[PDB]
Design a protein around this ligand. Sequence first.
Ligand code: DMA
Ligand code: DMA
Ligand SMILES: [Cl-]
Ligand SMILES: [Cl-]
Lengths: 331, 331
Amino acid sequence: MDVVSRLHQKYGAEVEKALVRYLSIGLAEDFREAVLYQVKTGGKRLRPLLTLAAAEAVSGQWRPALPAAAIVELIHNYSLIYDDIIDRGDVRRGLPTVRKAFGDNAAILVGIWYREAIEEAVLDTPKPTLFAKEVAEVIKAIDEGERLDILFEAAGRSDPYFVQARWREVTLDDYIKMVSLKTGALIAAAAKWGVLSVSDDRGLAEAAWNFGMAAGVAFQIIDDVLDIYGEIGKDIKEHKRGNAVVAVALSHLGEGERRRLLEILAREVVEEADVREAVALLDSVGAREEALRLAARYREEAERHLAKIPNNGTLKELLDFIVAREYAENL
Amino acid sequence: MDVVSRLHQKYGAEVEKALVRYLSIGLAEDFREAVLYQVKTGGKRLRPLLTLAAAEAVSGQWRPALPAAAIVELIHNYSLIYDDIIDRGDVRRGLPTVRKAFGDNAAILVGIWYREAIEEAVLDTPKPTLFAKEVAEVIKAIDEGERLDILFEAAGRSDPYFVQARWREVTLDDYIKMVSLKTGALIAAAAKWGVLSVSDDRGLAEAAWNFGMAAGVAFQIIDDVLDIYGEIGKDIKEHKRGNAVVAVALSHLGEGERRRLLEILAREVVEEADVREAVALLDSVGAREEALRLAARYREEAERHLAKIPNNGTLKELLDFIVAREYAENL
Ligand code: DMA
Ligand code: DMA
Ligand SMILES: [Cl-]
Ligand SMILES: [Cl-]
């Protein structure tokens, strides 16, 4: 029994109850199914589990962190609803997305509703004005990270802004700034908010934040590796320079090899043979191994921050699962 | 010089400054133009003017209400950004909409940003946790009102939810519930929030709320009359049962006339001759005059609530302008 299965057994029912409770406030009966849909499609709930484990580590209690746990999971799902609209995603967690089942525009009315459910949860935390400010900052970080990820694409969008503001160059630093915002900030928030729910120790809150950030970066990097070396080459087909292996490669490839890889990424339809050729360019500079070493760097940073947090056994198990440690080292 | 021109001269520059200030917090330079766009396209700013006039009426000061004034105008514009996406609107205030100039999906990233700018303004008010709760309630009221308005349509959408959840019947009561939410609540909030910014008198806050609600309903009704009798018959072309004249008519028309009017509204493309025929049905039961009498009812209610508020001269001028009193009585 993994730490996730165990924490789902301990915290799960209460997490699901809290999500429904905040979303249900003021919710019209004939809109209920549409609004509850995104939280009824499953998910690992890793973020709220992290929130509750962090609270429990520092204080021995997890229940006072339930409102914070619902905030972080509701923000996750709010971002997913709009992500599916923007990317026109049809499937998630093996089921139709909100935009697919209900329509793009119905999905927007749902997303708008989620942000106010998040606000109800904020008002239900131990420190409402502090949570309110951190929620605004984290949502803006996610929005900015998403903006950057799209502008780091090499092709494939029909929004004049995404086309015209597309960045000319994407460095490894750029890539790290982007994933810290898009993926890291909300995982940093999950940990930090668990601590804030049960403790006024600022040092512990800051350690939990730094721990979640680093873990989220390590996770995204690994995810990016899978999304290249497996459906082989999914991020190449999708024109992404905001991919760790690609960004690593672009930093090492010679001028002609560099120009070629960008040419492939910018192809309106990327063929199988384009993928293979792109992967060969990546391998020609050992980009995959370098990406995985970068993931190790952040995983080790997460561990140093985590060492500052008391009673951290369960959080250490979650970290290993989150950064898919066992798997990554096997690769 | 009308009350609006006068209040724009007094409050305007400070209102515009506050909008830019909250939106600018944490705003990336290359996203600035896209995000500031919706507030740089003009607008009467009637809502924040009402906020500031209400504060000034009860306390003699308007500046402490600037954060509340920015909240209400930012909510207005947040709702407009998504309204333009959902309705695929190309033009607003004589210029391209955000979705038009930047793209539907860029518009979403902008809308997401507006809600967090609204939250920064909330944190800057005299009573942050109270404002935070009222903002969540009012945004949910707008979202629900919008949901109802779309489900009150007789045709014309491609979202499975809008088609499948479309209401079978739309009564006058239904119509009033809908406009109270879609239009009234935020105008009620504008007034009430001005009072809350400078006073703990609950009776005055409640009077300002009731005053703004009633004014917003009267305004929407009149707007609906214009949107029938003038571009003649715009709401008929757009399949709206959520129109005061239409809703009045449906309540009085005989079975065959009633069935016919609905048939016209449900026509996938409504022709000129369908409009004229629809208008004749409306006139056959004096629906326009009845709608305007309903607008008078709410305008008179607004006045009774307004009478409970001290030093109310300017607020009375705004009310007349808001419910286009002079014009309505001329019609
Ligand atoms: C933090 C982490 C490793 C999450 C993995 O799943 P997900 O959050 O991307 O998706 P879901 O919400 O479906 O579990
Ligand atoms: C409250 C009221 C009578 C508003 C009229 O203008 P609007 O708010 O619909 O549009 P804009 O924001 O462009 O002035
Ligand atoms: Cl507990
Ligand atoms: Cl003042």
